[PDB]
Amino acid sequence: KSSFAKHPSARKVISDAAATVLADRSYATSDGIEISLKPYKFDPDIQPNE
Amino acid sequence: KSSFAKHPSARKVISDAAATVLADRSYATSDGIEISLKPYKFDPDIQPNE
Amino acid sequence: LTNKYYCPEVFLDAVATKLAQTAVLFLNVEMLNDFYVRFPREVEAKLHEH
Numbered sequence: 001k002s003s004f005a006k007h008p009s010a011r012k013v014i015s016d017a018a019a020t021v022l023a024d025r026s027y028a029t030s031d032g033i034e035i036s037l038k039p040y041k042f043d044p045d046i047q048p049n050e
Numbered sequence: 051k052s053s054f055a056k057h058p059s060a061r062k063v064i065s066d067a068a069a070t071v072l073a074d075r076s077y078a079t080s081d082g083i084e085i086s087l088k089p090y091k092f093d094p095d096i097q098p099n100e
Numbered sequence: 101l102t103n104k105y106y107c108p109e110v111f112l113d114a115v116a117t118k119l120a121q122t123a124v125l126f127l128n129v130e131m132l133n134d135f136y137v138r139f140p141r142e143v144e145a146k147l148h149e150h
Contacts, residue, residue: 060147060150063143063146064146064147066146067142067143067146067147068135068142070142071134071135071138071142072131074138075130075131075134075135075138076131078130079126079127079130079131082126082130083123083126083127086122086123086126087119087122087123090115090118090119094115094118094119096104096114096118100114100117100118
């Protein structure tokens with residue numbers, strides 16, 4: 001939708017910038033998520049509302 | 051309340067064993083807790099029921 | 101809850117309860133469960149060596 005509808009080179013530069021940032025942060029997010037889920041793996045206690 | 055009410059030396063051995071296990075896990079527990087709290091440090095948004 | 105800055109007491113108590121409960125889950129799994137499993141082994145070894 002942006003002003004970069006045309007210019008596939010500039011557009012793909014933007015896209016690849018997003019891609020390289022996400023790729024950089026991906027590992028820390030995955031490992032942190034497994035650590036944070038470590039308690040619910042052992043006992044995913046279910047409350048009546050859930 | 052245990053059978054080791056007397057024999058304070060062996061009792062101390064048991065107590066110190068508990069203390070050393072707890073000491074071994076203390077840091078990993080703390081760091082994991084701070085990682086799990088990482089989202090609430092940024093924005094601890096409060097639900098109406100809370 | 102919309103006037104949080106007008107009611108700091110209830111807000112701070114909500115934050116405290118939340119941090120406390122999620123920290124309690126990670127604590128129970130990691131530290132507590134590791135204690136239940138490692139403690140007897142440590143008692144046996146240290147008592148025998150003593």
